[PDB]
Write a protein that binds this DNA or RNA. Structure first.
Lengths: 232, 73, 190, 27, 179
RNA sequence: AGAACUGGCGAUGCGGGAUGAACCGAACGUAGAGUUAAGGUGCCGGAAUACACGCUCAUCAGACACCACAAAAGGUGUUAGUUCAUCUAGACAGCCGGACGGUGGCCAUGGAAGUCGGAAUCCGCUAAGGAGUGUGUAACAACUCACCGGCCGAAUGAACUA
RNA sequence: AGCGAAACCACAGCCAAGGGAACGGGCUUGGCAGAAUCAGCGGGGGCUUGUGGCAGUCAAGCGUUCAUAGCGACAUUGCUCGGCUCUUCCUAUCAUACCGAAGCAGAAUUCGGUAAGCGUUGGAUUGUUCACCCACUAAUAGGGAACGUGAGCUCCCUACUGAU
């Protein structure tokens, strides 16, 4: 007896489990022969409308994701465990995020596209941000004192409890307005960010973090060559 | 004494410095206090509690079943 | 289930040095010293490399196995308390009457006064536990700081500073007055 | 507080309750 | 909700008069006891049917409980107009009563009373929600209609409020019959 | 409750059940010696503070006696089982990230964007995202788990039975 | 200071519990108990509780086989001849004590928790009392101790208060 009884849920989604892992296992193995060139992406942190934008860019080439260990075993882990020749060499190099791509197009059209593609996104944990964000010493606003006060709406009194606990900032509330006594600074240029340092800048809606998706290993099916390139 | 006199107080001054903490922690302690009360609470206090706890358990049986039978349709 | 050999690990950093005879535990380090009796609990400490301590419990019942994990923590908190220190910040709020908190050196025991709170002529005098120091928060309006080594001294004295400020037979929502622990942290933030 | 002595009228008024449970099962 | 309770009150009296008259003729213990359980059984069933009205009477217990106490004979003065003309900015400084100034539609759903004194005499100023039929609309209509008061209608000669000045004129002539 | 049958007491002591009409043994000349019955062997009390395996903490445990009544259940007490399911294709727990596009679906209406409601709960994208599980808002936001994924490195969870 | 009966007399007379049978006074297990004696009172001789019964959408399991021999838990649908003093104990608390909850602003209220420490009134009715109302107060709670105090009402033994 005495155990943590889990939160009772009545959600309309069911657990995927192994019925999804098998559907991915076959889909990687069917796409290896149909297409000619393969890429493996280290997409660090990815917004969903960003991912669908890469999807809607081209419908010919296939994007593959799932579990890293699903992607190791469907392809190949060792010299014995393999579907194709020298296929294990690319799988040993990818260790971060799972991202993979099958393509039938030109090599130069792909790599030039992904080097140029850099998007607006929020500051991320453990990654540096190039801004010195300072909050005004009066009523705080939705932008946080970057744009003029007349354009912006004062922040909701409902979110201030969270501002004191997770966002830490010493916040008092007068007449439904979030107020700090001294001009607060959260981050500086050229400094590694913590989780709370990241989420503050996520709450104010500041897009002061560059997102550039990088690619590593390259393979051709009929030639069986493994190419290594470090782009950013 | 207006019409929403306490709700304004919220919308102007906030609940407490600590109202989220006392709340959340009381939600957790409940699981223990319930078990302490079902072990203690002698006599008619307990004989009502066990009968309260059963109506709470058949209600949950209904809610789980009538949700997972209408998952298909 | 009646386990056979249940052990934990206590990671000791380079500053501090632990001494454990019977079940009495010393933590000598940069900030000072901490001693704690653990005879009530009944386990087996084992130094392994001047850098890791294993508390084991043989033939344990679930209730005796439990007693083991809480010993790792209560020695961990004796170590972190000297290398890093414990600092508790308390902000106090009001509706009308501003609370006039001060510290008195009466009989050399160090008490904290609580005056005028919700319009009280009753002055609430609160003891200060030894090891723990009090200082007022500079550049922050109406805030007090409790900084010490032990987690007990600190957080218990924080608790005695808070519990004295209930509102007797009034509303929770309408009356905001009192002292509340704003932030829990460290003396040396790293 | 309650007792833990069985008074004999009860100790044997259990047997005469247990006998009634024997004849009840058969029918 | 006044009449179901009134019927229920005369039903619990009907259980007590009937079952007690049956109980004085209960010979053995088991007749005697069961007729008690029957008495409280019939009482409970009346009370169990009342779960529908007594939850509503709880909502009305709190809503009448916070409702302002206005006096129809005292020197009353209604403050009306379109939503967010500046009627909340009016009652704020003329008398010490907290009314919310917020740039949207229906800010104050209810009647806000503001007591003041002039020429050593007692007056009260009653704020109204705002007019275009809805329940919030009908409260503001019957505020001037039944109270012995002078209506302070407010208009704005600027781009503010959101509503046209032309809408305020057609508002005046349409609701003219009462004021 | 009534009927039949067979015992026990009645005319009957003796050991045991702390004590007793109904239970356990055992039907008696006077003794010695031995062995036992039923019941016991912490002390009152003659007799193992014996050995062996487990189980149990009780805020008035238990030794309560065809385990029969209050008993059908309750408990984040505890020990064992049974039957379903995940599990180095990395599970359970946990901070971290995504949690989307027609779409702010449609009637209701000052105001409904998943979340005051009514009837459908579609489709596309994918690793996975409920026309939505809650907090919150005038309405939005932000948060949320459910569903994935990464960081970690093994057993874990559910319904029950005793 | 003298004189000096009788009635009466198996035997003694401490509590508590158990001793099956309106039987405890000797028995069993306890608490206990110091010689000797005088003066008072009016002193004695595993029952039950809180949510009715009837028909039913119910719906875990058990029913020789197992929902259709059929029962079936909490729920929800239908009709509907007594009462005035003085002791003691019980908590199931009416006040007082401290809390918990409430759109509980304040004052007051309601519900609930620990608690029996300390408190709990006065007037018109009696053809059989088998009804109640405003007056105060913090509140005017419910009960037990069986023929409680009907040998206080319309020269048998000893507890106890004290004394040598």
């Amino acid at each position: 007896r005495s155990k943590r009884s889990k939160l009772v849920t009545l959600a309309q989604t069911d657990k995927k489990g192994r019925e999804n892992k098998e559907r991915i296992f076959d889909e990687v193995r069917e796409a290896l022969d149909t297409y000619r060139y393969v890429w493996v992406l280290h997409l660090d942190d990815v917004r969903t409308p960003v991912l669908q934008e890469i999807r809607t860019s081209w419908a010919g080439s296939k994007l593959i994701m799932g579990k890293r260990k699903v992607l190791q075993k469907a392809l190949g882990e060792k010299r014995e465990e393999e579907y194709k020749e020298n296929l294990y060499q690319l799988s040993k190099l990818c260790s971060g995020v799972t991202g993979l791509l099958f393509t039938d197009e030109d090599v130069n059209t792909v790599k030039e596209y992904f080097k140029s593609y850099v998007r607006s996104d929020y500051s991320r944990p453990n990654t540096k941000a190039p801004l010195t964000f300072t909050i005004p010493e009066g009523i705080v606003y939705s932008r946080g004192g970057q744009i003029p006060a007349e354009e912006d709406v004062p922040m909701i009194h409902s979110l201030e409890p969270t501002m004191r606990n997770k966002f830490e900032i010493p916040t008092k509330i007068k007449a439904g307005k979030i107020t700090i006594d001294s001009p607060y600074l959260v981050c500086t240029e050229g400094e590694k960010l913590d989780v709370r340092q990241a989420l503050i800048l996520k709450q104010f809606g500041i897009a002061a973090s560059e997102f550039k998706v990088k690619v590593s290993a390259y393979y051709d099916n009929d030639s069986s060559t493994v190419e290594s390139t470090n782009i950013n | 004494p207006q019409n929403d006199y306490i709700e304004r107080h919220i919308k102007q001054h906030g609940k407490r410095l600590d109202h989220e903490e006392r709340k959340r922690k009381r939600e957790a302690r409940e699981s223990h206090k319930i078990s302490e009360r079902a072990q203690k609470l002698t006599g008619w206090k307990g004989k009502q509690f066990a009968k309260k706890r059963y109506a709470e358990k058949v209600s949950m049986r209904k809610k789980i079943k009538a949700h997972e039978q209408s998952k298909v349709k | 289930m009646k386990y056979i050999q249940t052990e934990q690990q206590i990671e000791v950093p380079e500053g501090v040095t632990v001494s454990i005879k019977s079940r009495i535990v010393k933590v000598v380090g940069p900030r000072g010293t901490l001693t704690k009796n653990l005879k009530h609990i009944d386990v087996t400490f084992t130094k392994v490399n001047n850098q890791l301590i294993k508390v084991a419990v043989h033939n344990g019942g679930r209730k005796h196995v439990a007693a083991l994990r809480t010993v790792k923590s209560l020695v961990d908190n004796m170590i972190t308390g000297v290398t890093k220190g414990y600092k508790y910040k308390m902000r106090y709020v009001y509706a009308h009457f501003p609370i006039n908190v001060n510290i008195v050196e009466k009989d050399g025991a160090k008490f904290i006064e609580v005056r005028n709170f919700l319009g009280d002529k009753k002055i609430r005098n609160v003891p200060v536990r030894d090891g723990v120091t009090i200082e007022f928060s500079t550049n922050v309006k109406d805030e007090i700081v409790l900084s010490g080594n032990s987690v007990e001294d600190v957080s218990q004295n924080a608790a005695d500073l808070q519990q004295i400020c209930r509102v007797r037979n009034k509303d929770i929502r309408k009356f905001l007055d009192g002292i509340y622990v704003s932030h829990k942290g460290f003396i040396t933030e790293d | 507080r309650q007792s833990r002595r069985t008074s004999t009228k009860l100790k044997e008024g259990i047997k005469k309750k247990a006998s009634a449970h024997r004849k009840k099962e058969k029918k | 909700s006044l009449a179901a309770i009134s019927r229920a009150k005369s039903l619990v009296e009907q259980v007590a008069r009937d079952y007690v008259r049956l109980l004085k003729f209960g010979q053995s213990l088991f007749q005697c006891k069961q007729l008690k359980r029957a008495a409280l059984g019939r009482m409970a069933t009346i009370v169990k049917k009342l779960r529908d009205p007594l939850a509503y009477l709880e909502q009305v217990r709190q809503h009448i409980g916070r409702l302002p106490s206005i006096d129809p004979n005292t020197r009353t003065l209604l403050i009306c107009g379109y939503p967010n003309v500046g009627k909340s900015s009016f009652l704020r400084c003329i008398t010490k009563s907290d009314v919310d100034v917020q740039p949207y539609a229906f800010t104050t759903k209810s009647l806000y009373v503001g007591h003041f004194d002039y020429k050593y005499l007692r007056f009260q100023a009653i704020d109204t929600p705002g007019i275009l039929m809805n329940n919030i609309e009908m409260q503001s209509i019957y505020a001037i209609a039944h109270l012995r008061s002078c209506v302070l209608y407010f208009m704005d000669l600027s781009e503010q409020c959101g509503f046209t000045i032309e809408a305020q004129v057609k508002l005046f002539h349409s609701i003219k019959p009462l004021f």
